[PDB]
């Protein structure tokens, strides 16, 4: 009887959302449906384009039901407030959405409450202004959850999906595979933060006050995460956006998606995570996440930059190009904060910078660099990361690089933190080495035969080549 999706997000050990308010920007809703009655407030903010009643509130009623519905909702408690920015045909405007986001912020300023989650179950093309408005609202301290989009395409080409600081959610089905329906399906790529159930999701039907219907979409998926986030914020009202994101990632089911469903170049960029509620089991823990930059593009002096959130520390920095035409990467300071920068080679199509960004309070971190010598540098403190860059066209708390390369060590003073290094090598397109259960991968690199790059996937260090050796630095309290 438990809907498959609600079972899917239930942790392996288990026992909400009322201190939290969830805003919904959508079609009109049937607020008298028994799933949501008395739990959703209709603001009557409305900004929708002209067309070109049961059907009118179908989309919105279902999602309000996914988030907070008493029988089939994720966060059965939760309070919701609804804004109408989609018309009866489900169409809205960027300007209308902006006006809506502004309305939420004015409400907050006029009558402050607790943590806010804003669900944006909608998409248009890439919009500079819409992305900026989302970012600005995130920086004001509001959590935004958005749909990845339903076009079986790169989510970075859509808004608010591509919008920095917003949690972007793709949809997976009952077999934990990405939803695909012909030429349509879940979006994917590096702008997607995680996936959640978004096929065959039962919820409130606006046909009648007690009816139910199954719907599919990245909106349904985003609604699961809004519910999950609302529960997480009730339990821990002080979470920063970076902390909430690290928890959503940490508690997801990992490596459950068959990545063959995604286009080849998007596999590496797309996180293999299906959202789930935190367990009853939760003492301090080291949380890290992998942040891929935008591709640098092909200019000769091109650089890709991957950054961490203000409250995170950059513990390592790696890079990757599909061609292998790469000048490596370096950790460089910037506004008093370290970023991961990767360098394209002359004739390269471009490269990615790949940061490992971690929540490490009490950390004092620095970088130690040595110019081309092989080349070596050490933390003379724990080593959390090695990087290397070169300027040539071709070839023990210690990092070792190629003789023609500069080498950079990320060194932190973090008492109460233990780190070890685990190595693995073979004759090979991909070599792999994982931290032990309960350890957090902080750094991933290849021993210095021609590598495309290296990256952490959860707690597994992956090295890609064309005698290769993967090296993982793993830490815990």
């Amino acid at each position: 009887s438990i809907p498959w999706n609600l079972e899917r997000i239930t942790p392996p050990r288990y026992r909400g959302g009322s201190l939290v308010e969830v805003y919904l920007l959508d079609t009109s809703i049937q607020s008298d449906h028994r799933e949501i009655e008395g739990r959703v407030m209709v603001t009557d903010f409305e900004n929708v384009p002209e067309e070109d009643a049961s059907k009118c509130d179908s989309h919105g009623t279902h999602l309000a039901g996914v988030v907070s519905g008493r029988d089939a909702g994720v966060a059965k408690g939760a309070s919701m407030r609804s804004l109408r920015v989609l018309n009866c045909q489900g169409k809205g405007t960027v300007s209308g959405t902006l006006i809506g986001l502004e309305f939420i912020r004015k409400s907050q300023l006029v009558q402050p409450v607790g943590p806010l989650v804003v669900l944006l179950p909608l998409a248009g093309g890439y919009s500079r202004v819409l992305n900026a408005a989302c970012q600005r609202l995130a920086r004001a301290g509001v959590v935004l959850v958005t749909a990845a989009g339903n076009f079986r395409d790169d989510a970075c080409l859509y808004s608010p999906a591509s919008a920095p600081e917003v949690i972007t959610v793709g949809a997976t089905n009952a077999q934990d595979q990405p939803v695909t329906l012909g030429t349509l399906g879940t979006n994917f790529g590096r702008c997607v933060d995680l996936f959640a159930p978004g096929e065959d999701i039962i919820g409130a039907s606006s046909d009648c006050s007690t009816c139910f219907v199954s719907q599919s979409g990245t909106s349904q998926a985003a609604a699961h995460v809004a519910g999950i986030a609302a529960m997480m914020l009730s339990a821990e009202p002080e979470l920063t956006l970076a902390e909430l994101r690290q928890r959503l990632i940490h508690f997801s089911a990992k490596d459950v998606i068959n990545e063959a469903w995604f286009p080849e170049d998007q596999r590496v960029l797309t996180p293999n995570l299906v959202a789930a509620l935190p367990p009853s089991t939760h003492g301090w823990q080291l949380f890290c996440r992998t942040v891929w930059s935008a591709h640098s593009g092909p200019t000769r002096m091109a650089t890709a930059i991957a950054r961490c959130a203000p409250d995170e520390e950059l513990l390592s920095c790696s890079s990757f190009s599909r061609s292998g035409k790469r000048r490596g990467e370096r950790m460089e300071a910037q506004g008093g904060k370290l970023v991961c920068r990767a360098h394209n080679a002359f004739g390269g199509e471009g490269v990615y910078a790949i940061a490992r960004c971690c929540l490490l309070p009490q950390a004092n971190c620095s970088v130690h660099t040595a110019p081309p010598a092989g080349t070596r540098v050490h933390c003379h403190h724990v080593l959390t990361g090695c990087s290397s860059h070169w300027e040539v066209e071709d070839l023990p708390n210690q990092c070792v690089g190629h003789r023609e390369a500069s080498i950079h060590a990320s060194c932190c003073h973090a008492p109460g933190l233990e780190c070890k290094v685990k190595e693995h090598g073979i004759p090979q397109e991909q070599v792999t080495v994982a931290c032990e259960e309960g350890w957090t991968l902080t750094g991933c690199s290849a021993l210095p035969s021609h590598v495309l790059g290296a990256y952490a996937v959860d707690n597994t260090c992956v090295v890609r080549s064309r005698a290769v050796t993967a090296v993982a630095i793993c830490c815990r309290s």
Binding site: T27, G90, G96, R105, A123, G124, V129, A133, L137
Partner: protein
Amino acid sequence: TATFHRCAKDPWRLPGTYVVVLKEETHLSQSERTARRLQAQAARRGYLTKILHVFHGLLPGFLVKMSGDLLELALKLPHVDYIEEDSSVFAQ
């Protein structure tokens, strides 16, 4: 330095309405003055305009219904950061 942007998916564009985004610290009073100035400069050129909304609280700026002919003029207004043509969003 002010730039123009419109949706790359041509069918999703909504020409004739523009979001005028002003520089970050621009004050509401200035946003309003800038909108009126646009309306005046347009009117002297024979163009009707309508200010649909003035933005403040996240981004400063305004929403304006006008011919795209006026975009060169509008990009030269004081405080302008960029202008974006309105476009469609959809239930997912």
